[PDB]
RNA sequence: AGACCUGAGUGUGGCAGGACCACCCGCUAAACUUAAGCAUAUUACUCAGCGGAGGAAAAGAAAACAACCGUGAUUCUCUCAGUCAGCGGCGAGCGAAGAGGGAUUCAACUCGUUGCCGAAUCGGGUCUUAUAUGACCUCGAACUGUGGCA
RNA sequence: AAGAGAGUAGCACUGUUUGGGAAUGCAGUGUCAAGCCGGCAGGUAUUUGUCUGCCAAGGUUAAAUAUAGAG
């Protein structure tokens, strides 16, 4: 709040053959008599300084938030929309993809990689691996040095049994009890590739309800 | 967002829509509601006729919890009944009992055509409402 | 007991005998210094009522203050600005003389802690109060569970911050409820509460 | 040009905004999610330390004042002395076994007292009350088996001992009698209301009429 | 035994029906009781110190027979009509008992 | 010649003084500005000035609300509420409180006074591994009342 | 069986402060209580009679709160 205004500056007035901008007092510094306090002056105060009570956050209606999550889920069941978003699902047996519950008992990362290759989901994780690169612009100076694309998302009935799937680059884990719209539609575009476990798949009817049953 | 404002469209117009004559100066006509009876009189009299002056008695230390008294009409009573109980209420049979206090109502008014007989518990009631509910086949029970 | 007779006698300050005693005492006080140390309080029943005990570490002083209103210290009586701010002789101080006597003793003897005070005498130009003080470094004070709370550093110069009985009086803290809503924690704290602009995260 | 607008009363004429010359007077809530985590962490730590005591002490049930909230019930500050005497517990002792005591509250009714007495009797039967020293147990103290079989109440309201608040039940559907179908309820209510409203005017009329009887 | 209420919102004894209970005794009710020992102590002191200049003026007015003027004098000094009436009664008693 | 009261000198053991001052407590205290002029009003019980603490400070245990089917120390938050409360050249403008949902909460104690006792108290010295809430001594303080019980 | 804080509370004048309006709080001076039918409060002034809630003029006290140019 004090930036650019910590000077005892004053306008010289008219009759001295100079502009009427405020000028710095004193002498013997090469700064004396220079312009001050103006948004057009060097070392001056900026126009409309930014404040911290700007409205950073937003409110959204509860029903509208639930509407968006439902719509983004229905889009993930259409293979045309999945391909249009950018995922590689040419080797996937069926959409939506549902696998057995045994993947929760894995403990070694090698087992997870073998499972991904079996169901044909390894093409998408390979696409994310190759896309890794250094960000362009000032962003690489602000703790955002690397960028990468979004791969498949694996949905589990709870927040357990994820030790073997963590550390795999290009894979995301989700909990069916709290689905995030920021993950279901990255960048605002629908059609994310989702792999379901059987236990999590069977809970969808109870969590969201039907057209007649609440 | 700053990219939808008129200022983006006005880059290069030199006047931003305020005119070569007249210009954009600071506080002509004064600040706030100044001049309500001098040089702004026509606006005030035309749009806010009852602004200047007093009216009525005063009430020191008003407690609005003492005057709480919401109202409901006779024609909206079925919105409080059970979803099943209506449509099978008859003249001389068992009838649902509605408590207005538990639903947040104080006085029962008598507008409209009653749709089903019932027994209503209320604090206050109008004379027309009492007549209509009695004719239909219901009753009013006073509660405090 | 004997307290009742002493208490009821001091409720007759307008009687002939009490006026005679006070008149002689006022003449004696007029010829002493502004601050005087006493061996014993002149109103022992009143002193014990406000927290004095006959024990080592307790002391009593008598302090003199000048009666009348306040005069604004403006050169030659000239005030500037709007006429609403004029006037040099008719305005009054916002704290009472009882607390002015306490603060004068406290600022003079910095090794003591002021406890309370009470009224003693008055005349046409002077007022006299007696102040009870405690020495916090004494062994008997530090080992007494009823008074050792005053040793803690949070009670330093409590009379300069208006925390005594006299200071509470002019702050409005004798009142409660609807008579003290705008000054109850403190006048400044209430003003800060009612005037700060609040920004919720999701407004 | 001003048109047809509301007259503004925005109330922003003091120095609240921080600038180069003013400190300002503002309050923001950027610490809201961090403080939410901190309060939960402290509650969890306190529960671990005081185990197995319940987090919340027992409290009574009271009626909300004013006609607007006449029909509601909530939790009070502490149990009254008359309630404690009826239950059979001393006030000072009751404070050591997690019962809140309020010496200012008065009953004024029997329905309220009976509810709160029942709460105390239910709680006293469910108490365990570990002995002071295990080697020598006193009278009315839980044995070792009850001590090891002990859990901690975590309910935010201490209802695991007694339960929720108690209100009268709703009325079932019934049949209308014939006094109910003939009585005029507005006539009955209005007459009672008028007795209080015109008490003074009626008294003056009677006094003047009585004064005209000096014969 | 407080009066039981009716069941309606208006009229005399209005309100919801309960079972009212009598007020409990308290230690605050010891006020308004006579204070015999306090009264006796005040009598001893009043004997010792005697009268005051204000009380002598009221004494003279009562002797002449100006009761209304005595009340006006007392009310100005004490600031309350109830306080003034108590002061006049006290002086009347003392004169009678002397 | 000797006590008591009041008042000095010296000696022994201690404390105060300055800094920091964002937040907090007490005092003192403007004008620019707005009112399209201006004097009451507003800016504002704010800036400048003086004094005083802490890790927080201040407040706190009803001479409180309410008028109900009644609540129950303090502090803070949403709301009550920019108020069909109220103040104001009734102009410009200003402006709270009870109640309700919550955060916190095993939260409360005490002196004087009244009644029964009447140095049982404090300081100093010595002893008990101990400047003990212990014991003994003390023409030291204290009956112009320190302590203990209700 | 007793008692519970007096130049204190109140009142008048003057000044200031408050949304507080026949006077919300406070300060100076004058005057100055009650407690064998007590005192204070109950948001329009006075006198009289009821009802309701509390019992001033001494003291200590964690947590939930601030850090708007500090360490
Ligand atoms: K006085
Ligand atoms: Mg500057
Ligand atoms: Mg710069
Ligand atoms: Mg123009
Ligand atoms: Mg022109
Ligand atoms: Mg913080
Ligand atoms: Mg200093
Ligand atoms: Mg410091
Ligand atoms: Mg300005
Ligand atoms: Mg102007
Ligand atoms: Mg001008
Ligand atoms: Mg300052
Ligand atoms: Mg403190
Ligand atoms: Mg203001
Ligand atoms: Mg008292
Ligand atoms: Mg304190
Ligand atoms: Na102008």
Nucleotide nearest to C79 (CA to C1'): F30
D16 contacts C195 by C-beta, under 8 angstroms: yes
A195 contacts A99 by C-beta, under 8 angstroms: yes
Cα–Cα dist C53/A213, whole Å: 81
Please report which helix (H) or strand (E) contains residue C148, including its range: none
Q: Which two tokens stand for residue D62?
A: 């009271």
Contact residues, chain E, for D195 at CB < 8 Å: 11-12
Backbone angles phi, psi at A4, to 5 degrees: 85, -5
**Which residue in chain D has the smallest CA separation from B46?**
D4
Interface E:A, ≥3 CB–CB pairs < 8 Å = no
Kindly calculate the radius of gyration of chain E based on its CA atoms and give it in whole angstroms: 23
A182 contacts A44 by C-beta, under 8 angstroms: no
Chain A closest-CA separation from residue D13 CA (Å): 18
| Strand, helix or coil for residue C2 | helix
Cα–Cα dist C25/C45, whole Å: 18
Chain E within 8 Å of B99 (Cβ-Cβ)? no
Packed helices B127-136 and D185-197: angle between N→C axes, nearest 10 degrees: 160
A119 contacts A92 by C-beta, under 8 angstroms: yes
| Strand, helix or coil for residue B3 | helix
Q: Give the helix, strand, coil percentages of chain C, each rounded to 5.
A: 35, 15, 45
Cα–Cα dist A75/A82, whole Å: 8
Cα–Cα dist C37/E80, whole Å: 41
Listed by number, the residues of chain B in 6-35 with a beta carbon closer than 8 Å to a beta carbon of chain E are: none
Question: What is the CA(C95)–ligand 1 centre distance, in A?
Answer: 15
D77 contacts D59 by C-beta, under 8 angstroms: yes
B144 contacts E15 by C-beta, under 8 angstroms: yes
E14 contacts E5 by C-beta, under 8 angstroms: yes
Cα–Cα dist A54/A75, whole Å: 36
Task: Give Cα A202 to chain centroid, integer Å.
Answer: 29
Q: Centre a 10 Å sphere on the Cβ of residue C131 and count the other Cβ atoms it contains.
A: 24
Task: Give Cα C18 to chain centroid, integer Å.
Answer: 25
Asked how this structure was determined, the answer is cryo-EM
Task: Give Cα C161 to chain centroid, integer Å.
Answer: 11
Is residue C185 packed enough to be buried (19+ CB in 10 Å), middle (13-18) or exposed (0-12)?
exposed
| Strand, helix or coil for residue B57 | coil
Statement: the CB of B14 is under 7 Å from strand F: no
Q: Centre a 10 Å sphere on the Cβ of residue C134 and count the other Cβ atoms it contains.
A: 22
Tell me the CA–C1' distance in angstroms for D27 and G67. 12
B122 contacts B73 by C-beta, under 8 angstroms: no
C128 contacts C31 by C-beta, under 8 angstroms: no
Backbone angles phi, psi at D99, to 5 degrees: -125, 125
Is residue A20 packed enough to be buried (19+ CB in 10 Å), middle (13-18) or exposed (0-12)?
exposed
Chain D within 8 Å of A45 (Cβ-Cβ)? yes
Question: What is the CA(C50)–ligand 15 centre distance, in A?
Answer: 14
Give every CB contact of residue B33 below 8 A, 6+ residues apart in sequence: D7, D8
Chain E closest-CA separation from residue B116 CA (Å): 26
Q: Which among D19, D20, D26 is the nearest to A53, CB-wise?
A: D26
Give every CB contact of residue C30 below 8 A, 6+ residues apart in sequence: C123, C126
Statement: the CB of C46 is under 7 Å from strand F: no
Give every CB contact of residue C191 below 8 A, 6+ residues apart in sequence: none
CB contact under 8 A, C196 and D27: yes
Q: Which residue matches tokens 């696998």? A: A99
Q: Which two tokens stand for residue A101?
A: 């519950």
Statement: the CB of D174 is under 7 Å from strand F: no
For strand F, give the nucleotides within 7 A of a protein CB: 5-7, 13-17, 23-32, 34-36, 39-47, 51-55, 57-60, 62-78, 80-83, 85-87, 90-115, 122-124, 141-147
Cα–Cα dist A33/A24, whole Å: 5
Residue B142 β-bridge partners? B122
Cα–Cα dist D42/A154, whole Å: 35
CB contact under 8 A, A2 and D26: no
**Which residue in chain D has the smallest CA separation from C199?**
D28
Cα–Cα dist C191/D28, whole Å: 18
Please report which helix (H) or strand (E) contains residue C59, including its range: strand C58-66
Statement: the CB of C181 is under 7 Å from strand F: yes
CB contact under 8 A, E41 and C4: yes
Q: Which residue matches tokens 């901008």? A: A21
The residue numbers preceding gaps of C to N over 2.5 A in chain D are none
Report CA torsion sign: D177, D181, D182, D184.
Answer: positive
Statement: the CB of E71 is under 7 Å from strand G: no
Selection from A176, A132, A137, A175 nearest residue A150 by Cα: A132
Which residue is nearest nucleotide F13, judged by alpha carbon to C1' distance? C138
Nucleotide nearest to E15 (CA to C1'): F69
Contact residues, chain C, for A53 at CB < 8 Å: 199
A44 contacts A38 by C-beta, under 8 angstroms: yes
Among chain D, residues having any CB pair with chain E shorter than 8 Å are 70, 82, 106-111, 113, 189, 192-193, 195-196
Statement: the CB of C44 is under 7 Å from strand F: yes
Q: What is the DSSP code string of B70-131?
A: -EE-GGGGGGTS-TTTTTS--SSS-B-EEEHHHHT--EE---S---S--EEEESEE-HHHHH
Q: Which residue matches tokens 């009278």? A: D139
Contact residues, chain B, for D189 at CB < 8 Å: 124-125, 142
D11 contacts D3 by C-beta, under 8 angstroms: no
**Which residue in chain D has the smallest CA separation from E7?**
D189
Q: Which two tokens stand for residue E97?
A: 């008992």
CB contact under 8 A, D18 and A1: yes
Three state DSSP letters for chain A: CCCCCCCCEEECCCCCCCCCCEEECCCCCCCCCCECCCCCCCCCCCCCCCCCCCCCCCCCCHHHHHHHHHHHHHHCCCHHHHHHHCCCCCCCCCCCEEECHHHHHCCCHHHHHHHHHHCCCHHHHHHHHHHCEECCCHHHHCCCCEECCCCCEEEECCCCCCCCCCCCCCCEEEECCCCCHHHHCHHHCCCCCEEEEHHHHHCHHHHHCCCCCC
Q: Which two tokens stand for residue A152?
A: 């498949």
Report CA torsion sign: E88, E90, E92, E94.
Answer: negative
Cα–Cα dist E36/A7, whole Å: 79
Which residue is nearest nucleotide F64, judged by alpha carbon to C1' distance? C177
Nucleotide nearest to C169 (CA to C1'): G26
Contact residues, chain D, for E18 at CB < 8 Å: 109-111
Residue B24 DSSP code: -
Task: Give Cα D33 to chain centroid, integer Å.
Answer: 29
Packed helices E67-78 and E53-64: angle between N→C axes, nearest 10 degrees: 160
Statement: the CB of C53 is under 7 Å from strand G: no
Interface D:E, ≥3 CB–CB pairs < 8 Å = yes
Cα–Cα dist A153/D82, whole Å: 64
Cα–Cα dist C104/C127, whole Å: 14
Contact residues, chain E, for B143 at CB < 8 Å: 7-9
Strands C58-66 and C126-134: antiparallel
Count Cβ neighbours within 10 Å for each residue of D87-120 and write b for 16 or more, e otherwise: bebebeebeeebbbbbeebebeeeebbebbbebb
Q: Which two tokens stand for residue C10?
A: 């001091």
C129 contacts C120 by C-beta, under 8 angstroms: yes
C5 contacts E44 by C-beta, under 8 angstroms: yes
Q: Which residue matches tokens 């007989």? A: B117
Q: What is the DSSP code string of chain E?
A: -PPPP-SSSSSTT-S----B-PPPP-GGGGTTS--HHHHHHHHHHHHHH---HHHHHHHHHHHHT-HHHHHHHHHHHHS-HHHHHHHHHHHHHHHHH-
Question: What is the CA(D13)–ligand 8 centre distance, in A?
Answer: 36
Q: Which among B93, B97, B139 is the nearest to D181, CB-wise?
A: B139
Annotation-wise, does B92 bind a ligand? no
| Omega cis (within 30) before D52 | yes
Cα–Cα dist C117/A126, whole Å: 86
Selection from C90, C134, C123, C100 nearest residue C23 by Cα: C123
Give every CB contact of residue B53 below 8 A, 6+ residues apart in sequence: none
Cα–Cα dist C43/C29, whole Å: 15
| Strand, helix or coil for residue D136 | coil
Nucleotide nearest to C92 (CA to C1'): G27
**Which residue in chain B has the smallest CA separation from D168?**
B102
CB contact under 8 A, A57 and C199: no
Interface test with A, best of C196, C197, C198, C199 (most A CBs within 10 A): C199
Q: Centre a 10 Å sphere on the Cβ of residue C61 and count the other Cβ atoms it contains.
A: 22
Chain D within 8 Å of A46 (Cβ-Cβ)? no
Q: Centre a 10 Å sphere on the Cβ of residue A190 and count the other Cβ atoms it contains.
A: 19
């Amino acid at each position: 709040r004090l930036s650019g205004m910590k000077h005892s500056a004053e306008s010289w007035g008219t009759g001295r053959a100079v502009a009427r901008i405020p000028r710095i007092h004193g002498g013997g510094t090469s700064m004396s008599g220079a312009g001050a306090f103006g948004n057009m002056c060097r070392g001056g105060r900026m126009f409309a300084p930014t404040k911290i009570f700007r409205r950073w956050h937003r409110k959204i209606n509860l029903h509208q938030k639930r509407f968006a999550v439902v719509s983004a889920l229905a889009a993930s069941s259409l293979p045309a929309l999945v391909m249009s978003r950018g995922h590689k699902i040419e080797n996937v047996a069926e959409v939506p993809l549902v696998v057995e519950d045994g993947v929760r008992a894995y403990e070694k990362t090698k087992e997870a990689m073998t499972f991904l290759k079996t169901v044909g989901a390894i093409d998408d994780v390979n696409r994310v691996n190759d896309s890794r690169q250094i960000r362009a612009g000032r962003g690489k100076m602000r703790n955002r040095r690397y960028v990468a694309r979004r791969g498949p998302m694996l949905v589990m009935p709870d927040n357990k049994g994820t030790r073997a799937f963590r550390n795999i680059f290009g894979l995301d884990l989700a909990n069916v009890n709290s689905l995030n719209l920021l993950h279901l539609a990255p960048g605002g575009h629908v059609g994310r590739f989702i792999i379901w476990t059987k236990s999590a798949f069977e809970k969808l009817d109870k969590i969201f309800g039907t057209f007649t049953e609440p | 967002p700053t990219r939808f404002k008129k200022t983006r469209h006005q880059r290069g117009s030199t006047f931003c829509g305020y005119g070569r004559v007249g210009k954009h100066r600071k506080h002509p006509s004064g600040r706030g509601n100044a001049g309500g009876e001098h040089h702004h009189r026509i606006n005030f009299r035309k749009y806010h006729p009852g602004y200047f002056g007093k009216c009525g008695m005063n009430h020191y230390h008003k407690k609005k919890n003492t005057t709480w008294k919401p109202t409901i009409n006779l024609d909206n009573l079925t919105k409080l009944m059970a979803k099943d109980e209506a449509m099978k209420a008859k003249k001389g049979e068992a009838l649902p009992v509605i408590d207005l206090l538990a639903n947040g109502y104080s006085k029962l008014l008598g507008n409209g055509h009653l749709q089903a007989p019932c027994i209503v518990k209320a604090r206050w009631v109008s004379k027309l409402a009492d007549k209509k509910i009695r004719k239909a086949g219901g009753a009013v029970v006073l509660q405090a | 007991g004997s307290f009742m007779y002493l208490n009821e006698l001091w409720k007759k300050k307008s009687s002939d005998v009490m006026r005679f005693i006070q008149r002689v005492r006022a003449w004696e006080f007029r010829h002493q210094h502004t601050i005087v140390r006493l061996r014993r309080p002149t109103r022992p029943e009143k002193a014990r009522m406000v927290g004095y005990k006959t024990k080592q570490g307790y002391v009593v002083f008598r302090v003199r203050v000048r009666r009348g209103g306040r005069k604004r210290p403006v050169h030659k009586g000239i005030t500037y600005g709007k006429p609403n701010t004029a006037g040099v002789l008719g305005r009054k101080l916002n704290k009472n003389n009882r607390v002015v006597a306490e603060q004068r003793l406290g600022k003079k003897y910095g090794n003591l802690r002021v406890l309370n005070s009470y009224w003693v005498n008055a005349d046409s130009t002077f007022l006299w109060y007696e102040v009870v003080a405690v020495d916090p470094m004494h062994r008997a004070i530090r080992r007494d569970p009823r008074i050792n709370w005053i040793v803690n550093a949070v009670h330093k110069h409590r009379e300069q911050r208006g925390l005594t009985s006299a200071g509470r009086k002019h702050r409005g803290l004798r009142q409660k409820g609807h008579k003290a809503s705008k000054l109850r924690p403190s006048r400044r704290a209430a003003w800060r509460r009612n005037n700060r602009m609040v920004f919720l995260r999701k407004r | 040009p001003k048109g047809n607008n509301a007259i503004p009363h925005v109330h922003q004429r003091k120095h609240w905004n921080p600038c180069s010359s003013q400190k300002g007077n503002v309050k923001v809530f950027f610490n809201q999610p961090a403080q939410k985590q901190r309060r939960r962490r402290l509650r969890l730590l306190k529960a671990k330390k005081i185990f197995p005591r319940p987090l919340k002490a027992l409290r009574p049930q009271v009626n909300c004042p004013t006609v607007r909230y006449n029909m509601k019930r909530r939790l009070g500050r502490g149990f009254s002395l008359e309630e404690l005497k009826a239950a059979g517990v001393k006030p000072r002792y009751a404070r050591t076994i997690g019962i809140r005591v309020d010496r200012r509250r008065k009953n004024k009714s029997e329905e309220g007292m009976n509810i709160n007495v029942q709460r105390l009797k239910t709680y006293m039967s469910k108490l365990v009350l570990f002995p002071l020293n295990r080697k020598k147990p006193q009278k009315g103290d839980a044995t070792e088996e009850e001590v090891k079989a002990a859990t901690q109440d975590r309910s935010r309201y201490g209802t695991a001992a007694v339960g929720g608040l108690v209100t009268p039940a709703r009325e079932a559907p019934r049949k209308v009698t014939e006094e109910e179908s003939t009585k005029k309820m507005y006539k009955f209510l209005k007459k009672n209301h008028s007795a209080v409203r015109f008490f003074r005017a009626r008294n003056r009329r009677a006094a003047r009429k009585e004064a005209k009887e000096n014969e | 035994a407080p009066v039981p209420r009716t069941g309606i919102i208006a009229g005399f004894n209005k309100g919801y029906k309960t079972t009212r209970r009598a007020r409990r005794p308290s230690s605050n009710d010891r006020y308004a009781l006579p204070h015999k020992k306090l009264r006796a102590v005040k009598a001893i002191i009043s004997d010792l110190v005697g009268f005051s200049p204000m009380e002598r003026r009221v004494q003279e007015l009562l002797r002449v027979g100006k009761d209304k003027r005595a009340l006006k004098f007392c009310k100005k000094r004490l600031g309350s009509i109830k306080a003034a009436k108590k002061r006049r009664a006290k002086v009347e008693e003392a004169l009678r008992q002397q």
